[PDB]
Structure 1
Amino acid sequence: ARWFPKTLPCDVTLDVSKNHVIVDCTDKHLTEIPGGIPTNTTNLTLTINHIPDISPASFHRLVHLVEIDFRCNCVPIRLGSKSNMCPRRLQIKPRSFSGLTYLKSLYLDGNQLLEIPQGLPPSLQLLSLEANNIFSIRKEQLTELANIEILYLGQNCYYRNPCYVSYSIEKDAFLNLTKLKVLSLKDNNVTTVPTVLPSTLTELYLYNNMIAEIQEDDFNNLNQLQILDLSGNCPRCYNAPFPCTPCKNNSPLQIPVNAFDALTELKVLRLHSNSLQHVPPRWFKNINNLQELDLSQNFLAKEIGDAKFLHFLPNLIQLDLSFNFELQVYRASMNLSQAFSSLKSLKILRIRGYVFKELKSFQLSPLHNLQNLEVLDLGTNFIKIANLSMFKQFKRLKVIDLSVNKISPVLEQLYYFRYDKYARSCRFKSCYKYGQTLDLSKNSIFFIKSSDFQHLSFLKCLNLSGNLISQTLNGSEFQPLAELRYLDFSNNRLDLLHSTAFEELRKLEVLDISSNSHYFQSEGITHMLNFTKNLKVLQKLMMNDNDISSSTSRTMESESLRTLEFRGNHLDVLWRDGDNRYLQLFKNLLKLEELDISKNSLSFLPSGVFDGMPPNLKNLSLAKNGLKSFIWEKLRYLKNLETLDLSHNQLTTVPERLSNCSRSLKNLILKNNQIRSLTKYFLQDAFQLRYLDLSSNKIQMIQKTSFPENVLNNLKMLLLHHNRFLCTCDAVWFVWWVQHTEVTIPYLATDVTCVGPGAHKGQSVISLDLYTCEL
């Protein structure tokens, strides 16, 4: 169905709305630009390869190029692979880009360049040079960039990519870049704000540098600046997980009180880790539009209790004051200045790492009439004592986060302590939705009783993950929580002695009791797995990693439940050959459509398992079980089966006729097994099949009988990579069909390969010429 097989090792896409032909050669172990890139190419990506040089030949025919992504073909030593270090910085020969009349975006990050590449066409709007070795900027090397709007020069001189000197920027080096909008000089060992900058700037990134002082006029002309980041100059180095050098004498970054006077358009101001001890109100007198203010990682503990500057910020949306605690101090309470009430627009308040023993209702009173407050983050504070009922005055909030505290009656794990949380990689460029959420995860709650939740009926999601609850819930513990839709109870020590546990949460839709294995690990203890009958609107139950190998009740019942995750348990033990008592454990989950019973050590399936399955099972995972055998005919019992996941097992054969096993099956995942061949008529008349993963097996040959083309043409996707294909003349049909087929087959260029015979070993099947079989 194709007259010309595609052999280029890059994904090619056409977006003819925007007249884009996109050629993505990311990470193809290329040592040369591949030949035969389409002449109409507009966006070309060659990131993560080992192409040692660029020359006028590189893009000779590619005159329609709009974007070139040529990053990380020689990344600096400490930043790159220690198994394939780059031997020499990329070589860019003269003329290499001058002919690209339409070039608008050029990425040359991560190539060990020593200088700003010259000869760039005047069409260029974006130039990216992060993670090179360019640490002296001269006006003359920037003349060629007259039309530039976006310029990235960071990560060229810092601990992971050292240049061993101060960064150097000539006076007015950027002044004649009259269109420059975005200037990034982060992570560069800069010692002063370079001046004068063009008044067109909207975004300026100077963070993680060696700037000790702002001159009063450094930002004088930037009346268009919208984002200003000066973080990490005079860092707060306590507990930094990167080499960190503070300013002398615990000095803060010094900022004159009038330094921001011209920035009338400023929306974002980041002063993270600048060792600030005061926030003078004078700073914000001519900025009335500020929306986001990051003041995390300073020494503003006392200032939080005063904080006159908040009065000048009626429009502020986000305020971050996290990690301002004074060293070695465990305050008794949280002193929030009354000035907080002046933050009429405030949506998000974050004060992690204030460090205080006891939170009491009045202490939040400055916040009671902030009408737009949606998120209040008091995590990592070592709070020991908290009357949860105080949040009855915060029913309007979307998320109350008390995660990681010591209480006892979404940002990344590494966030406040990252070096550069906005760093770009070489590759590219949750229950909140249910309503009001009270996150008490990773605290020290060992016992709960119903009064702990008095006045919180409004809650829709409660997160108790990772506490120390080691209790036999009987339905009395959660009684105020009349609207709760989601309880995360994972990583506790639930003792399911009573089948009435959780029954008071009459509106519960999702229950996570995963990783509550403790009491399931000791023999002879009663466990009531039929606690589900009482939850009349429960949709989804997660019981992963509970090590369940025994159950006092023999069936689980639900009229509502649609999804059960039962991964990481011991159904091999409950279904021990000879023991029939648990073969209908899920049969009475009458509405169940999704069942994950992966990772249950099921090396075989006892007969009666499939008969025991509830009648509407659609999506069944048996992955990661060490299944050594499988009676495909037993799928006939599963009359609604659409998705069968058998990946990461030990199967050696597929059914003789998959259609004779299941008339409903649409998605068959067989990846990571031991299959060495397909049955003669494997997919004959399997009209419902849409998705088939045979990758990571040991298949040597595939004949046309196994793969009838009326079936192949219905497949959305057919995965065949990482097998042991034998490219002899017996493979002529398969090699021809792979080369000419419309069916989507991932990794044809990278991982659909001959293992032999010798002559063809390691060769891609897509590129195989078998004319010697037709002489």
Structure 2
Amino acid sequence: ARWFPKTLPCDVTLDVKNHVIVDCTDKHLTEIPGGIPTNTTNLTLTINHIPDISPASFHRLVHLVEIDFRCNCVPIRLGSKSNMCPRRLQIKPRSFSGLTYLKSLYLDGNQLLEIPQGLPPSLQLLSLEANNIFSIRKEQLTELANIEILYLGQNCYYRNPCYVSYSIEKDAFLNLTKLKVLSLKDNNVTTVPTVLPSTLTELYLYNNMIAEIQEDDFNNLNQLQILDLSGNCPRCYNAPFPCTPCKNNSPLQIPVNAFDALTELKVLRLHSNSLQHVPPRWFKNINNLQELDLSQNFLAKEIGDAKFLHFLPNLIQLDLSFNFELQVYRASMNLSQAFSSLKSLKILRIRGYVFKELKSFQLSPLHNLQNLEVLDLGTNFIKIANLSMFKQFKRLKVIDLSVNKISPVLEQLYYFRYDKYARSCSCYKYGQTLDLSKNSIFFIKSSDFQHLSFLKCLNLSGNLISQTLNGSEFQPLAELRYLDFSNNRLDLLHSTAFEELRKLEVLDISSNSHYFQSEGITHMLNFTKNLKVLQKLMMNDNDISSSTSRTMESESLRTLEFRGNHLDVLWRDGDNRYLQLFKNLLKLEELDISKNSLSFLPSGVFDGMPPNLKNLSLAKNGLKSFIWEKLRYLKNLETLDLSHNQLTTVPERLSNCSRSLKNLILKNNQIRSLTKYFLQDAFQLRYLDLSSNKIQMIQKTSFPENVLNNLKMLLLHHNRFLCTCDAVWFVWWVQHTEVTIPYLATDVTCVGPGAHKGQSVISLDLYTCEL
């Protein structure tokens, strides 16, 4: 099909407008490759080991609007220790001055000592994060007259130390009259640099050594929308990065008038500034403020008073998390009445207040916040809460009591990571959610959920629930669509478990292995019959090796996850009793029986499958053999996942095994060669992964072109390809096909013979085979 093989080790993409995008991310390059198109608008060379840039680098590439050249020499402590960068990136004079249309230049993570000079006046975005530039001088910024976005952070901090204070000359940035975004985070800065251009919308000064704000510091910044001063005078208790507090337990000192000019301010972040008081006067001339982060201060007392809230009627989010007093376990949470001023508030987070008992009235300041959607009281060591108090919170989307000690999306390292916005080189959608995960609930009964019939998802994941559910425990939860009961100890003595949840669409009972791990106890896996609208059942990692019921039954269920169990034991060769375990799941479309130690599949398994099975996984089973002909029984099979097993062969004729099969995943097996007519007449096939096997040769008979050319994708990487004259067809076909084959640059490689060892097949000249 293709007249000229793409030999360039980079992905190439058009988009008309008006971009030619060349992506060489992580291609182990030591040089900018030759042959990059002349029309290239966006060139990405991130994560390679290109030791320099010169006028030759970009000579022909005059239409470049963006160079992303990040992490070609990452600082020692941030980067790989197996392949350390020997010496800082070298940038020779006039390497960029030619690039008349260059709007964006990323040079992060290259150990640069200075702001590269000779940059073109078209430049809008310059990024220099994670270099060794720790002294900014007005003279070096004159080239940046038209610059709008300037990232200078992470040049002086514990992962990349400069061993001195950061220095910024007086008025360094003032004459940058178009600068909108300035980031000087993670830099050992000691004072807000001044005067700043008034054109700024976003100023990031967090994680620095600024002990005081002068009353003038933000005087002219009347366009500023985001200000972040977090992590100056940090709260260091249980900090999981090195942490130096301001001396004398001092807070970051901010004059009461410091923010007066900031009338456009939308976001103010004062996380981890050791604040003991939040003076109302701060917010006098800011009315448009939407997001305020006061997490990680010492505001426990202030939470009970908080007069400043009366000045914040447009505030959408408020974070007061991790303000607890050291060594104190409060009896209760004292929320000021001032919380009732927050007419616009959608999200309130008060993790880590740390208190024993939550009572209904303590939340009364929140009762009339009409727009409140999220109340997050996680990680509080709450021991006692009458859950019925949430009858007054039907309007909320999420009530998060996660990680508490109750008994009758944000990343998991969010509040405690160093820089949550550092650049590297779920049942909420069902409706109202009560997250009780990771608590101490050992016993449940109906009245625990009294007045909570509005709930659509309940998360009980990671409690201690160890009882014989009989259908009486959740009786009030008449609307519940999702129940996450994972990480408990479900005891399925009774097949009536869960049947009171009459609207239940999704049930997770994964990781309830405790009672399935024990011998000669009853287990009623036919409990599914009673749940008439159940769509998805997850029963992963339960170690299930025995069952009292021979069959699971459902008229509704579409997806069953049954991974990490012992069907190998249930289907012990010679025992027929459980071969139809899934057969009466009549609408079942997706079955995951990966990680079940199925070395082999007894005969009967495929006949036993329910008639509409579409997506079957047998991954990670140690399968050593597989009667491919038995796929004939699975008349609606579309996706078959046999990844990570020990198969040594493919079928003689795939078309003779299944007429429906579209996606066949055979990665990570022991396949040494393909059968002579493997894919012959397999017209349905659209996706074939044969990566990470031990294949030497592929001949045309096995891979007919009328089948290959309808493939959306064909994965061949990490095999043992022998590039002799017998491979002439494969090598040609690979070089000239339209079919998408990932990693042709990286990992489609001859292992021999000698001459061609280690070489990419895409680059292979086999002219000697046609003399």
Residue 387 of structure 1 corresponds to which residue in structure 2? 386
TM-score normalised by the chain length of structure 1: 0.99
CA offsets per residue over residues 481-505 of structure 1, 9 Å max, x none? Answer: 0000000000000000000000000
CA offsets per residue over residues 662-691 of structure 1, 9 Å max, x none? Answer: 010001000000000000000111010011
CA offsets per residue over residues 591-640 of structure 1, 9 Å max, x none? Answer: 00000000000000000000000000000000000000000000000000
CA offsets per residue over residues 12-41 of structure 1, 9 Å max, x none? Answer: 00001x110000000000000000000000
Tell me the distance in 1 between the aligned counterparts of 2:13 and 2:433. Answer: 42
Q: What secondary structure does 1:275 align onto?
A: coil
Tell me the distance in 2 between the aligned counterparts of 1:343 and 1:442. Answer: 30
Tell me the distance in 2 between the aligned counterparts of 1:727 and 1:197. Answer: 62
CA offsets per residue over residues 714-755 of structure 1, 9 Å max, x none? Answer: 110000000000000010000000000011100001010000
Tell me the distance in 1 between the aligned counterparts of 2:457 and 2:469. Answer: 18
Shift of 1:246: 0.4
Shift of 1:235: 0.2
Tell me the distance in 1 between the aligned counterparts of 2:97 and 2:736. Answer: 38
Q: Is 1:536 matched with 2:532?
A: yes
Residue 216 of structure 1 corresponds to which residue in structure 2? 215
TM-score normalised by the chain length of structure 2: 1.00
Tell me the distance in 1 between the aligned counterparts of 2:515 and 2:579. Answer: 23
CA offsets per residue over residues 129-179 of structure 1, 9 Å max, x none? Answer: 000000000000000000000000000000110000000000000000000
CA offsets per residue over residues 486-545 of structure 1, 9 Å max, x none? Answer: 000000000000000000000000000000000011111000000000000000000000
Uncovered stretches (5+) of structure 1, i.e. residues with no partner: none
Shift of 1:206: 0.2
Stretches of 4+ aligned residues off by more than 2 angstroms: none
Shift of 1:558: 0.2
Residue 3 of structure 1 corresponds to which residue in structure 2? 3
Tell me the distance in 1 between the aligned counterparts of 2:200 and 2:325. Answer: 36
CA offsets per residue over residues 351-372 of structure 1, 9 Å max, x none? Answer: 0000000000000000000000
Tell me the distance in 2 between the aligned counterparts of 1:63 and 1:311. Answer: 56
CA offsets per residue over residues 302-341 of structure 1, 9 Å max, x none? Answer: 0000000000000000000000000000000000000000
Shift of 1:398: 0.1
Q: What secondary structure does 2:584 align onto?
A: coil
Shift of 1:250: 0.3
Tell me the distance in 1 between the aligned counterparts of 2:46 and 2:659. Answer: 45
How does 1:270-289 map onto structure 2 within 5 Å? Answer: 270-289=269-288
Tell me the distance in 1 between the aligned counterparts of 2:761 and 2:81. Answer: 31
Tell me the distance in 2 between the aligned counterparts of 1:87 and 1:671. Answer: 36
Q: What secondary structure does 1:634 align onto?
A: helix
Q: What secondary structure does 1:656 align onto?
A: coil
Q: What secondary structure does 1:293 align onto?
A: strand
Tell me the distance in 2 between the aligned counterparts of 1:730 and 1:211. Answer: 69
Tell me the distance in 1 between the aligned counterparts of 2:485 and 2:661. Answer: 34
Tell me the distance in 1 between the aligned counterparts of 2:438 and 2:409. Answer: 15
Tell me the distance in 2 between the aligned counterparts of 1:641 and 1:287. Answer: 61
Residue 657 of structure 1 corresponds to which residue in structure 2? 653
CA offsets per residue over residues 264-312 of structure 1, 9 Å max, x none? Answer: 0000000000000000000000000000000000000000000000000
Shift of 1:3: 0.7
Tell me the distance in 2 between the aligned counterparts of 1:113 and 1:707. Answer: 50
Tell me the distance in 2 between the aligned counterparts of 1:466 and 1:486. Answer: 16
Tell me the distance in 2 between the aligned counterparts of 1:29 and 1:509. Answer: 47
Residue 755 of structure 1 corresponds to which residue in structure 2? 751
Q: What secondary structure does 1:141 align onto?
A: helix
Determine which of 510, 515, 521 is the counterpart of 2:517. 521
Tell me the distance in 1 between the aligned counterparts of 2:80 and 2:704. Answer: 44
CA-atom RMSD, angstroms? Answer: 0.3
Shift of 1:410: 0.8
Residue 617 of structure 2 corresponds to which residue in structure 1? 621
Shift of 1:8: 0.1
Shift of 1:551: 0.2
Q: What secondary structure does 1:518 align onto?
A: coil
Q: What secondary structure does 1:391 align onto?
A: helix
Q: What secondary structure does 2:688 align onto?
A: strand
Q: What secondary structure does 2:507 align onto?
A: strand
Tell me the distance in 2 between the aligned counterparts of 1:655 and 1:79. Answer: 48
CA offsets per residue over residues 443-465 of structure 1, 9 Å max, x none? Answer: 00000000000000000000000
Tell me the distance in 2 between the aligned counterparts of 1:185 and 1:436. Answer: 40
Q: What secondary structure does 1:739 align onto?
A: helix
Residue 374 of structure 1 corresponds to which residue in structure 2? 373
Tell me the distance in 1 between the aligned counterparts of 2:246 and 2:609. Answer: 67
Shift of 1:2: 0.7
CA offsets per residue over residues 67-88 of structure 1, 9 Å max, x none? Answer: 0000100011111111111111
Uncovered stretches (5+) of structure 2, i.e. residues with no partner: none
CA offsets per residue over residues 109-139 of structure 1, 9 Å max, x none? Answer: 0000000000000000000000000000000
Tell me the distance in 1 between the aligned counterparts of 2:612 and 2:407. Answer: 43
Residue 413 of structure 2 corresponds to which residue in structure 1? 414
Determine which of 680, 686, 691 is the counterpart of 2:687. 691
Q: What secondary structure does 1:22 align onto?
A: strand
Question: What is the number of residues matched between the two proteins?
Answer: 771
Tell me the distance in 2 between the aligned counterparts of 1:569 and 1:434. Answer: 29
Q: Is 1:183 matched with 2:179?
A: no
Tell me the distance in 2 between the aligned counterparts of 1:320 and 1:518. Answer: 38
How does 1:707-722 map onto structure 2 within 5 Å? Answer: 707-722=703-718
Determine which of 583, 586, 592 is the counterpart of 1:590. 586
Tell me the distance in 1 between the aligned counterparts of 2:155 and 2:532. Answer: 60
Tell me the distance in 2 between the aligned counterparts of 1:642 and 1:244. Answer: 54
CA offsets per residue over residues 407-436 of structure 1, 9 Å max, x none? Answer: 00011110111100000011xxx0000000
Residue 60 of structure 2 corresponds to which residue in structure 1? 61
Tell me the distance in 2 between the aligned counterparts of 1:156 and 1:497. Answer: 61
Q: What secondary structure does 1:536 align onto?
A: coil
Q: What secondary structure does 2:43 align onto?
A: strand
Tell me the distance in 2 between the aligned counterparts of 1:516 and 1:132. Answer: 49
CA offsets per residue over residues 455-480 of structure 1, 9 Å max, x none? Answer: 00000000000000000000000000
Q: What secondary structure does 1:183 align onto?
A: strand
Shift of 1:380: 0.2
CA offsets per residue over residues 186-215 of structure 1, 9 Å max, x none? Answer: 000000000000000000000000000000
Tell me the distance in 1 between the aligned counterparts of 2:316 and 2:351. Answer: 18
Shift of 1:641: 0.4
Tell me the distance in 1 between the aligned counterparts of 2:409 and 2:107. Answer: 32
How does 1:91-490 map onto structure 2 within 5 Å? Answer: 91-426=90-425, 430-490=426-486
Shift of 1:713: 1.1
Tell me the distance in 2 between the aligned counterparts of 1:395 and 1:577. Answer: 53
Tell me the distance in 2 between the aligned counterparts of 1:661 and 1:28. Answer: 39
Q: What secondary structure does 1:610 align onto?
A: coil
Q: Is 1:30 matched with 2:26?
A: no
CA offsets per residue over residues 225-249 of structure 1, 9 Å max, x none? Answer: 0000000000000000011000011
